[PDB]
Scaffold this motif. Structure first.
Motif, PDB file in Angstrom:
ATOM      1  N   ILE A   1      13.726  10.511   9.085  1.00 55.61           N
ATOM      2  CA  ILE A   1      13.638  10.039   7.698  1.00 55.61           C
ATOM      3  C   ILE A   1      13.770  11.202   6.710  1.00 55.61           C
ATOM      4  CG2 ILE A   1      12.201   8.057   8.354  1.00 55.61           C
ATOM      5  CD1 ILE A   1       9.888   9.704   6.845  1.00 55.61           C
ATOM      6  N   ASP A   2      13.661  10.868   5.412  1.00 58.82           N
ATOM      7  CA  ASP A   2      13.672  11.744   4.246  1.00 58.82           C
ATOM      8  C   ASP A   2      14.900  12.664   4.262  1.00 58.82           C
ATOM      9  OD1 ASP A   2      13.408  12.772   1.796  1.00 58.82           O
ATOM     10  OD2 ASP A   2      11.272  13.351   2.002  1.00 58.82           O
TER      11      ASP A   2
ATOM     12  N   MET B   1       9.480   9.475  12.260  1.00 52.51           N
ATOM     13  CA  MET B   1       8.675   8.270  12.419  1.00 52.51           C
ATOM     14  C   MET B   1       8.812   7.803  13.867  1.00 52.51           C
ATOM     15  SD  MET B   1       7.307   7.661   9.457  1.00 52.51           S
ATOM     16  CE  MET B   1       7.014   9.404   9.698  1.00 52.51           C
TER      17      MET B   1
ATOM     18  N   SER C   1       9.183  11.907  -4.648  1.00 52.02           N
ATOM     19  CA  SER C   1       9.110  10.478  -4.355  1.00 52.02           C
ATOM     20  C   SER C   1       7.685  10.073  -3.969  1.00 52.02           C
ATOM     21  CB  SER C   1      10.095  10.081  -3.282  1.00 52.02           C
ATOM     22  OG  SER C   1       9.693  10.591  -2.028  1.00 52.02           O
TER      23      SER C   1
ATOM     24  N   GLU D   1      14.009   0.264   6.430  1.00 54.39           N
ATOM     25  CA  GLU D   1      13.296  -0.384   7.525  1.00 54.39           C
ATOM     26  C   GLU D   1      11.916   0.260   7.689  1.00 54.39           C
ATOM     27  OE1 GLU D   1      15.141   0.119  11.357  1.00 54.39           O
ATOM     28  OE2 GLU D   1      15.559   2.251  10.937  1.00 54.39           O
ATOM     29  N   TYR D   2      10.927  -0.579   7.996  1.00 57.14           N
ATOM     30  CA  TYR D   2       9.575  -0.133   8.293  1.00 57.14           C
ATOM     31  C   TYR D   2       9.481   0.253   9.768  1.00 57.14           C
ATOM     32  CZ  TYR D   2       4.564  -0.934   9.533  1.00 57.14           C
ATOM     33  OH  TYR D   2       3.280  -0.872  10.036  1.00 57.14           O
ATOM     34  N   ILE D   3       8.885   1.424  10.026  1.00 58.10           N
ATOM     35  CA  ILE D   3       8.504   1.819  11.380  1.00 58.10           C
ATOM     36  C   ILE D   3       6.974   1.820  11.465  1.00 58.10           C
ATOM     37  CG2 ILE D   3       8.705   3.627  13.103  1.00 58.10           C
ATOM     38  CD1 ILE D   3      11.393   2.298  12.317  1.00 58.10           C
ATOM     39  N   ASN D   4       6.454   1.205  12.533  1.00 53.07           N
ATOM     40  CA  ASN D   4       5.010   1.194  12.778  1.00 53.07           C
ATOM     41  C   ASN D   4       4.617   2.553  13.372  1.00 53.07           C
ATOM     42  OD1 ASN D   4       2.353   0.565  13.012  1.00 53.07           O
ATOM     43  ND2 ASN D   4       2.636  -1.295  14.252  1.00 53.07           N
ATOM     44  N   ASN D   5       4.568   3.543  12.482  1.00 49.38           N
ATOM     45  CA  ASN D   5       4.416   4.952  12.812  1.00 49.38           C
ATOM     46  C   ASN D   5       2.951   5.294  13.130  1.00 49.38           C
ATOM     47  OD1 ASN D   5       5.379   7.841  12.759  1.00 49.38           O
ATOM     48  ND2 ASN D   5       3.916   7.930  11.053  1.00 49.38           N
TER      49      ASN D   5
ATOM     50  N   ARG E   1       3.688  10.503  -0.055  1.00 52.46           N
ATOM     51  CA  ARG E   1       4.268  11.102  -1.252  1.00 52.46           C
ATOM     52  C   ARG E   1       5.079  12.341  -0.850  1.00 52.46           C
ATOM     53  N   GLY E   2       5.919  12.785  -1.783  1.00 50.93           N
ATOM     54  CA  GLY E   2       6.640  14.025  -1.662  1.00 50.93           C
ATOM     55  C   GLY E   2       6.815  14.650  -3.028  1.00 50.93           C
TER      56      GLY E   2
ATOM     57  N   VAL F   1       6.152   6.668  -1.470  1.00 56.46           N
ATOM     58  CA  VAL F   1       6.644   5.630  -0.602  1.00 56.46           C
ATOM     59  C   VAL F   1       5.543   4.588  -0.379  1.00 56.46           C
ATOM     60  CG1 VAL F   1       7.520   5.093   1.671  1.00 56.46           C
ATOM     61  CG2 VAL F   1       8.372   7.096   0.490  1.00 56.46           C
TER      62      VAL F   1
ATOM     63  N   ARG G   1       0.845  -1.199   0.000  1.00 59.95           N
ATOM     64  CA  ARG G   1       0.000   0.000   0.000  1.00 59.95           C
ATOM     65  C   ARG G   1       0.878   1.245   0.000  1.00 59.95           C
ATOM     66  NH1 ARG G   1      -1.565   2.198   5.386  1.00 59.95           N
ATOM     67  NH2 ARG G   1      -0.020   1.471   6.905  1.00 59.95           N
TER      68      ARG G   1
HETATM   69  C1  LIG Z   1       3.928   8.337   6.895  1.00 63.14           C
HETATM   70  O1  LIG Z   1       2.927   7.423   7.350  1.00 63.14           O
HETATM   71  C2  LIG Z   1       3.343   6.198   7.789  1.00 63.14           C
HETATM   72  C3  LIG Z   1       4.654   5.742   7.741  1.00 63.14           C
HETATM   73  C4  LIG Z   1       4.952   4.474   8.207  1.00 63.14           C
HETATM   74  N1  LIG Z   1       6.266   3.956   8.239  1.00 63.14           N
HETATM   75  C5  LIG Z   1       7.418   4.324   7.626  1.00 63.14           C
HETATM   76  N2  LIG Z   1       8.529   3.676   8.045  1.00 63.14           N
HETATM   77  C6  LIG Z   1       9.688   3.998   7.474  1.00 63.14           C
HETATM   78  C7  LIG Z   1       9.752   4.982   6.518  1.00 63.14           C
HETATM   79  C8  LIG Z   1      10.794   5.572   5.720  1.00 63.14           C
HETATM   80  C9  LIG Z   1      10.210   6.492   4.933  1.00 63.14           C
HETATM   81  N3  LIG Z   1       8.835   6.525   5.169  1.00 63.14           N
HETATM   82  C10 LIG Z   1       7.918   7.427   4.532  1.00 63.14           C
HETATM   83  C11 LIG Z   1       6.570   7.103   4.398  1.00 63.14           C
HETATM   84  C12 LIG Z   1       5.731   7.999   3.789  1.00 63.14           C
HETATM   85  C13 LIG Z   1       6.220   9.197   3.300  1.00 63.14           C
HETATM   86  C14 LIG Z   1       7.556   9.529   3.420  1.00 63.14           C
HETATM   87  C15 LIG Z   1       8.065  10.872   2.910  1.00 63.14           C
HETATM   88  C16 LIG Z   1       8.802  10.769   1.587  1.00 63.14           C
HETATM   89  C17 LIG Z   1       7.925  10.406   0.474  1.00 63.14           C
HETATM   90  N4  LIG Z   1       7.184  10.155  -0.366  1.00 63.14           N
HETATM   91  C18 LIG Z   1       8.404   8.624   4.028  1.00 63.14           C
HETATM   92  C19 LIG Z   1       8.555   5.589   6.149  1.00 63.14           C
HETATM   93  N5  LIG Z   1       7.359   5.306   6.708  1.00 63.14           N
HETATM   94  C20 LIG Z   1       3.944   3.644   8.706  1.00 63.14           C
HETATM   95  C21 LIG Z   1       2.633   4.101   8.728  1.00 63.14           C
HETATM   96  O2  LIG Z   1       1.570   3.396   9.228  1.00 63.14           O
HETATM   97  C22 LIG Z   1       1.869   2.263  10.012  1.00 63.14           C
HETATM   98  C23 LIG Z   1       2.323   5.369   8.264  1.00 63.14           C
HETATM   99  O3  LIG Z   1       1.037   5.837   8.333  1.00 63.14           O
HETATM  100  C24 LIG Z   1       0.767   6.639   9.510  1.00 63.14           C
END
Ligand SMILES: COc1cc(Nc2ncc3ccn(-c4cccc(CCC#N)c4)c3n2)cc(OC)c1OC
Ligand SMILES: [Cl-]
Ligand SMILES: [Cl-]
Length: 329
Positions: A169-170, A158, A46, A109-113, A42-43, A48, A38
């Motif tokens: 990030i970014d 994040m 880029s 790496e994924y962060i549960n943000n 966006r930026g 993501v 999913r």
């Molecule tokens: C941002 O939202 C969510 C982000 C994450 N997790 C996540 N972990 C690592 C990275 C590295 C870059 N990114 C990112 C994502 C989106 C945009 C951008 C900016 C650059 C571009 N395009 C970087 C990351 N996002 C999880 C979520 O859910 C679990 C979210 O939803 C809340």
């Protein structure tokens, strides 16, 4: 002229390979190793996607880079490689291309943000201190490594609020600091742009990030997000001047021999320097302390050279509770 107070000579003391990003040659793997799940965001250049690595079932993030100079891509990749393993820096896992489009992408790496618009309103006083300390660790690290992030803002931090894990990030706007270098001021995001950017002062440094961090702190403790809500770049400086005052602004401009765009002559007016206590009300009182206000006063200064460094900020009394809690019961 202007020079950073810390870490000024970092890059000149290193091998040229370290900072000469144009000479860096990434090795591009196959993005087919990753199933996109999913879109996460966006930026400008880029988008993501959350993804699963098909080979090992690791959840990651894939940043597909929109058309840019190969040079900007090399810069971000080299910076991420130089910072890898650093405290609270997002981990770059791989550099890949889609076989059909040939489009380059970075895997992190994924962060549960948790979305900052949901998170910030549930943070306690201690939680704000804790996460700001974590973000300072990231900034002191990158600054020590000769790198300015230049896009500090909540969207680029994040936070996994269960694991208590924070990542900056970014790194797409990040740059190597070289003393006396003039940099482009079209960096950061409007609400987080330091006064130096807004008055077109190019000889800036790591201290730009500390302005941005102060903006984040102010929004977190006062619950006014963003804190300085400019309608455009001109209005952004007016919003700052309504708080920091105009006398101090004019002082700053004279100190650095900065010519002020005359469009400011009719919109800045005359403003007192305000008490930070003015921003306190019943719904934020529990997040504000004398220490928070003292720190804010020492970060949100026009004069970039006078702002606390990341390490000085980490040493501030506001973070004593965090430093104490790092030894668990
Ligand atoms: C941002 O939202 C969510 C982000 C994450 N997790 C996540 N972990 C690592 C990275 C590295 C870059 N990114 C990112 C994502 C989106 C945009 C951008 C900016 C650059 C571009 N395009 C970087 C990351 N996002 C999880 C979520 O859910 C679990 C979210 O939803 C809340
Ligand atoms: Cl990113
Ligand atoms: Cl204090």
């Amino acid at each position: 002229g202007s020079r950073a107070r810390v870490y000024a000579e970092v890059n000149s003391l290193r091998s040229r390979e370290y900072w000469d990003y144009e000479a860096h040659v990434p090795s591009w793997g196959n993005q087919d190793d990753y199933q996109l799940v999913r879109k996460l965001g966006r930026g400008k250049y880029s988008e993501v996607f959350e993804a699963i690595n098909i080979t090992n079932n690791e959840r990651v993030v894939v940043k597909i880079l929109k058309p840019v100079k190969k040079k900007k891509i090399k810069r971000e990749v080299k910076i991420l490689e130089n910072l890898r393993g650093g405290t609270n820096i997002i981990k770059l896992i791989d550099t890949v291309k889609d076989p059909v489009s040939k489009t380059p992408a970075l895997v992190f790496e994924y962060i549960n943000n948790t979305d900052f618009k949901q998170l910030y309103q549930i943070l306690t006083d201690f939680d704000i201190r804790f996460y700001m300390y974590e973000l300072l660790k990231a900034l002191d690290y990158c600054h020590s490594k000769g790198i300015m992030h230049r896009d500090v803002k909540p969207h680029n931090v994040m936070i996994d609020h269960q694991q208590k894990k924070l990542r900056l990030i970014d790194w797409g706007l990040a740059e190597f600091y070289h003393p006396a270098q003039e940099y482009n001021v079209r960096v950061a995001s409007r609400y987080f742009k330091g006064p130096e950017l807004l008055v077109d002062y190019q000889m800036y440094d790591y201290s730009l990030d500390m302005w941005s961090l102060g903006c984040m702190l102010a929004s977190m403790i006062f619950r006014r997000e963003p804190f300085f809500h400019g309608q455009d770049n001109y209005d952004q400086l007016v919003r700052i001047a309504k708080v920091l005052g105009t006398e101090e602004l004019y002082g700053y401009l004279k100190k650095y021999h900065i010519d002020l765009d005359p469009h400011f002559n009719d919109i800045l007016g005359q403003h007192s320097r305000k008490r930070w206590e003015n921003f306190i009300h019943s719904e934020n009182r529990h997040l504000v302390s004398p220490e928070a206000l003292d720190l804010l006063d020492k970060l949100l200064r026009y004069d970039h050279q006078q702002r606390l460094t990341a390490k000085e900020a980490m040493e501030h009394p506001y973070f004593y509770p965090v430093v104490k809690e790092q030894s668990q019961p």
